[model samples]
Target: MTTHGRATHYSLGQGNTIANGNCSMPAVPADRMYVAVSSPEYSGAAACGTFLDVTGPKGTVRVQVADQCHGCEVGHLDLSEEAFRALGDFNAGIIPISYVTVRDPAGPTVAIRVKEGSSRWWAGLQVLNAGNRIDRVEIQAGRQWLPLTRTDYGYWVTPSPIQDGPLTVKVTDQYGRAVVLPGLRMAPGEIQRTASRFYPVH
Candidate 1:
């Protein structure tokens, strides 16, 4: 187990909390399986699309890394209201936690969301449930994989729209775990799921 400690709760707000570069999800909410963590564990946008198996006093709940907890100490996960409530009582506010990266969960596929203004001319993408901080992203163009740029805000974007509907994504993490996300269309704010993950070594 990764043993990430002391899980707490965070309610959604307007403040700019960057998660998956707001690619697959425009809002950070509990229903999204979201969690915010501090570093060196936090992997910026790469960590955004990953999943975790979190175990608290009450039980274990799987969650997604939706943002960073700049104020949290190392090993702390700031969970959303929905995720926090899954493991223990919401009134508890804080719970001692042990969490591990979950690879290939049986439930909830990884996702890719098209950012607003994405078009056949220029396309923006958010890869969710990446399972790790992404080292590289590639969009499948028929037989060729077009490399997409990682933006400062955490999106995999291309200034040039390469093709028509039905897009496929290939993602690689810092640890070298790689997975391809398939069967997608670059629709703005559209979310889709993938069976891949970048779960870390135990």
Candidate 2:
């Protein structure tokens, strides 16, 4: 059965708790569903779990709640490994997500990048999250997870630079839970432009 409203908070250590007190246990959705996480509260060391059905423009999947996203919101739900693979590149860590609970036809969206600079040859990206929720985005370059920080409203900025080759961007809710995007091709000395399609959350 589908449950609504926010769950109560609980605490736990990494790889130790079955269901942390911080999350609610909801039945997996039969069809595709939408999922999102709470902000501020999700950005800690606690590992929590919650259930959700994720439905995106590409398709949907039922995911078991796992992990504590120190950066996710109160209502945020983390996806299982199997469920995460179904949505996008499991390695990238950012996902474009929308909440079914919200009435607006528009859904949540975030663009992720490894680096940001003025020149195309610089090999950086100016990623943007134009959704209402706090987005947890991750960048991978040369087999390392780069540290990414977000604004109070959920917009994130890359803490490091991404040099050369291909880079991946993953976007998730405040809890550090994520959805992955496709690889972006960066050329030398190219000036990447931010899309005007996004509306700022703050």
Q: TM-score: which candidate is best?
A: 1
Candidate 1 C-alpha RMSD relative to the actual structure = 5.0
CA displacement after TM-score superposition, residue 135 of candidate 2 (Å): 4.2
| lDDT of every predicted structure (CA atoms) | 0.71, 0.40
Please state the error at residue 36 of candidate 1 in Å: 1.0
Model 2: runs farther than 4 Å from truth?
1-105, 108-130, 151-155, 175-177, 187-202
Worst 10 residues of 1 by lDDT: 15-24
Q: lDDT: which candidate is best? A: 1
Candidate 1 clashes between residue pairs 3 or more apart in a chain or in different chains: 23-126, 46-133, 46-134, 49-129, 49-130, 50-131, 110-194
Candidate 1 residue-wise lDDT, 1-202, digit = tens: 5875798898555434334323334566446567877755665456665678899888888887666787889878888788888888989978998989876544444577777788878887876655556788888877998888876455888845677867778877766878777778767866666656565333
Q: Model 2: per-residue lDDT, tens digit, 1-202?
A: 3333322222232322122223321222222232334544334311122234565334666442323455556544455444555666656465664423221123224443333242323333334332323344566756767656653322245555555555566555544455555555553223223432233333
Global CA lDDT computed for model 1: 0.71
Flag regions of model 1 displaced more than 4 Å: 13-33, 108-111, 129-135, 140-144, 152-154, 159-168, 172-186, 192-202
